[PDB]
């Protein structure tokens, strides 16, 4: 029977396949999860930094609004005294 | 939605508004809560003096925004 | 051939593919099976993001290999 003569040539290669596959599967999974971990962390941090830029830009706007209001208040009240 | 109106005296007024409400409506809502006549109100947002006719969305005023109010001072 | 797609919460999507199919087709198949728009999808294999125009063959993605799906933020 053919698997009997083919056995000696192929059996060691085939008896080790399942381990060779699991090694590559684990190596793929380890490289992807490490990259993904950097992806999620970098994405989350930069989103937080952007939202904090917008917060300070709004606060910088309120301070300028307040000083514009304070100038307008002095100007328009001096006029109608 | 909510917006805030900060007076130069430090006071902070809270108003319930719609994005389609005009600046005239906003002055009317400040009149109800604080008794100040709308003629004696000037509102500033984003370095601009708001015009009675335009709406809050016209000035890109969204929720939690803070407007600044200028009053008449009979000293 | 069959491949597997791991999602962020651990689920596994099963797809019937060919070595010739492009990353676009894969995402389209994920849409048909999971209802996820392709523009939300980021597919990662061997630690690299996969480009819509290349094929599974271009990325040495073989039978029963596992791809990793990471959706994009709504804003950002």
The Cα B2–Cα B64 span in angstroms is 6
- Dig out the tokens for B52 from the structure: 């009675």
Instruction: Say how far apart CA C69 and CA B22 lie, in whole Å.
Output: 47
Q: Are strands C48-49 and C12-16 parallel, antiparallel or unpaired?
A: unpaired
Q: Which of C66, C70, C76 sits opposite A36 (nearest CB)?
A: C70
- HSE toward the beta carbon, residue A43, CA cutoff 13 A: 13
Residues of B in contact with A80 (CB under 8 A): 72
Rounded CA gap, B9 and B3, in Å? 18
Q: What residues contact C15, with CB distance under 8 A and at least 6 apart? A: C2, C3, C4, C5, C26, C29, C30, C33
Q: Report yes or no: C30 and C36 within 8 Å, Cβ to Cβ.
A: yes
DSSP, collapsed to helix, strand or coil, labels residue C62 as: coil
* Chain B and chain C touch, per 3+ beta carbon pairs within 8 A: no
| Distance between CA atoms of residues B13 and B10, nearest Å | 10
Technique of determination = X-ray
Chain breaks in chain A (C to N over 2.5 A) after: none
C27: tokens are: 């995402």
- Rounded to whole angstroms, how far apart are CA atoms A58 and B46? 9
Which domain range does residue A7 map to?
A: 2-79
Measured CA to CA, the distance from residue B69 to residue C31 in angstroms comes to 52
What is residue A29's three-state secondary structure?
Answer: helix
Q: Which two tokens stand for residue C25?
A: 């087709």
Q: Which residues of B touch A51 (CB under 8 A)?
A: none
């Amino acid at each position: 029977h053919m698997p009997g003569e083919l056995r000696r040539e192929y059996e060691e290669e085939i008896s080790k396949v399942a381990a060779e596959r699991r090694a590559s599967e684990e190596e793929e999974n380890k490289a992807s999860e490490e990259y993904i971990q950097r992806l999620l962390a970098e994405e989350e941090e930069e989103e937080k930094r952007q939202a904090e830029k917008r917060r300070r830009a709004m606060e910088e706007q309120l301070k300028s609004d307040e000083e514009l209001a304070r100038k307008l208040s002095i100007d328009i009240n001096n006029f109608c005294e | 939605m909510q917006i805030f109106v900060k007076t130069l005296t430090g006071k902070t007024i809270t108003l319930e508004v719609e994005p389609s409400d005009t600046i005239e409506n906003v002055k009317a809502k400040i009149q109800d809560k604080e008794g100040i006549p709308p003629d004696q109100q000037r509102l500033i947002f984003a370095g601009k003096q708001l015009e009675d006719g335009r709406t809050l969305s016209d000035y890109n005023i969204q929720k939690e925004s803070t407007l600044h109010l200028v009053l008449r001072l009979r000293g």
